[PDB]
Amino acid sequence: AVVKCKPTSPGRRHVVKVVNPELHKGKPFAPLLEKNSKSGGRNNNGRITTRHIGGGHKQAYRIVDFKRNKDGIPAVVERLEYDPNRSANIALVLYKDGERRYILAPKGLKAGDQIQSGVDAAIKPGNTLPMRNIPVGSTVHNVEMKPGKGGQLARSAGTYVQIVARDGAYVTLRLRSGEMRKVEADCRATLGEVGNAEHMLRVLGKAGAARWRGVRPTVRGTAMNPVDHPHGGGEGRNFGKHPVTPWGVQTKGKKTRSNKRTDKFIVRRRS
Amino acid sequence: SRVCQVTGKRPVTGNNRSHALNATKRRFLPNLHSHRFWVESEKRFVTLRVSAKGMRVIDKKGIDTVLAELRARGEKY
Amino acid sequence: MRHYEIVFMVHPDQSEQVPGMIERYTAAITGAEGKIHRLEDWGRRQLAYPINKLHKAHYVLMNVEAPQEVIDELETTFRFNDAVIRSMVMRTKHAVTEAS
Amino acid sequence: MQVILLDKVANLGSLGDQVNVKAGYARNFLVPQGKAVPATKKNIEFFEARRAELEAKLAEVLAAANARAEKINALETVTIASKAGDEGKLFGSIGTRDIADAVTAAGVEVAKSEVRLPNGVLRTTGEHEVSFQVHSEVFAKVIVNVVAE
RNA sequence: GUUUAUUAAAAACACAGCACUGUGCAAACACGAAAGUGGACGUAUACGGUGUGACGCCUGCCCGGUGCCGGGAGGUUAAU
Ligand SMILES: [Mg+2]
Ligand SMILES: [Mg+2]
Ligand SMILES: [Mg+2]
Ligand SMILES: [Mg+2]
Ligand SMILES: [Mg+2]
Ligand SMILES: [Mg+2]
Ligand SMILES: [Mg+2]
Ligand SMILES: [Mg+2]
Ligand SMILES: [Mg+2]
Ligand SMILES: [Mg+2]
Ligand SMILES: [Mg+2]
Ligand SMILES: [Mg+2]
Ligand SMILES: [Mg+2]
Ligand SMILES: [Mg+2]
Ligand SMILES: [Mg+2]
Ligand SMILES: [Mg+2]
Ligand SMILES: [Mg+2]
Ligand SMILES: [Mg+2]
Ligand code: NA
Fold it and tell me: Which positions 209-268 on chain A have a beta carbon less than 7 angstroms from any atom of strand E?
């Protein structure tokens, strides 16, 4: 799965590819596609609000079923498909009634496996249940934060959530960041980890590989002039300043979370 | 905009005076809050963006009295 | 065919549903062309130490002759059943019918 | 805020007092519900002078037929359908919704919000001691059973 | 590869890689008086910021100063 490229040229010497032979070679399921136009990090006002965004390959958007609300009807996986939008791979599933959908592909999922959602579903991976029927200690992913919201936690490749406790109406989750968080037990989760766990093992190898992922170069603040960045100035590699964002806020350790609305759900912050 | 529907209170302008009496322009904003008011006559709730003083006015008078004045002014609710 | 000895302890609040559990599992083994040799039901026994802050666990013993796949799905049933505490499956290399 | 009451309030009401409540209590709870109206002199005579007895009789003849539950036990200990697996373990829980409609003739007779569940929504096969608040002091104690069909 | 259009193409910038740090999602952050938008129809194997800069072998001591993080007993301390 992880292949080192031979150094036939610089820019190829350090490339490490993540090759999955089970990904569908061919076109994605057209009914579940739609346009996803690039923004270049610009917003309503046409101004850069997120730096280092722009370019990269054109990408169609795959409508992935995060809700997983086709309860009781079994589905069979037919393809593992590459998704340019997420780090995870997606699986095309066919329900018994003839409906096809895209779901996040869990680790042990391949073509032909059976999945279903609902309260009566089994505890095999790829099945979606409320975290009230899922046993405590189970490894889940695609976790809803509100009942019916859709599933926002543990969606990246190789990620998962551990159900740590169930105090009746709520369930405590250990997130991939190490944070303990309360979630309503009626929220839904898919059993197993997210597949494509070797995604983090890839090495881009060259500047161009990041460029065609839509990532524009980052200029260090200390390389700028004082008018551009709080870092910057000096007759050759001077810093003499506490590291800050381009807008003067201290970076290198300073809590920026200020919600007061969701702290009731956070059992313990990450460490 | 930030206007009380009952009293007509809107942002007024003033100065920030420092200890050195430096004057910088500032706005005084009304204490506005959207609030669903129960209209006993019409068997329904009417949401109004009112200042806190506007709420006190609605308690002093009736809600119907204030709605009549709002209707007279052309203020839609 | 392999001989297994299954001892599983049940929460002493679902004990009145234990007979429902018993015939569900025996049907699974018999349905899969197995055969139950012993089906002793020891009832509500004191534990030697608290398990899940409990005592009085309901012990059920059964010696069966089933194929592997039935046993694993039986163990899976025990694992995901919260009314079952501390199941225990062992090979016995012989059918056992004598009482305990 | 001075307010004149229209019915029995738990901790400050005697159906005719002019207690001094906080503005939020009157504005958001007491007035929008039929419990009190502001104590303007307009209302005070327009309360005391002519209805100091007719709303008293209306409340009393309304407390009657509400204190008349007639649903302390509707038919028997009512048995309600549900979908569940083994070991009890109600898959689809029973809530204030399902209790109300099933206990009555398809929910027409009784409303949905007067169902009190001390144990919360029902999550296991069995009979549970659910309450029923038809009126401000009415506690109907129907036993509801749930069966996995 | 990029750069001072019009005296500087470089050892400068970027870079893949590395590390720290923030961020549990109505994310942080940014643009906006706000609505809203980008981040992202993404979800910690993600995203932002900062420094360093393939790779190899490595990265030692100091928390006194400044900053940041945590604690709150005590002292001081605003409006009221
Ligand atoms: Mg960036
Ligand atoms: Mg970088
Ligand atoms: Mg840089
Ligand atoms: Mg310079
Ligand atoms: Mg500056
Ligand atoms: Mg500098
Ligand atoms: Mg410099
Ligand atoms: Mg120097
Ligand atoms: Mg250029
Ligand atoms: Mg040029
Ligand atoms: Mg030049
Ligand atoms: Mg020049
Ligand atoms: Mg030149
Ligand atoms: Mg420079
Ligand atoms: Mg340069
Ligand atoms: Mg450098
Ligand atoms: Mg120190
Ligand atoms: Mg401190
Ligand atoms: Na220090």
Answer: 209-210, 215, 217-223, 229, 231, 237, 239, 242-247, 249-259, 261-262, 265-266
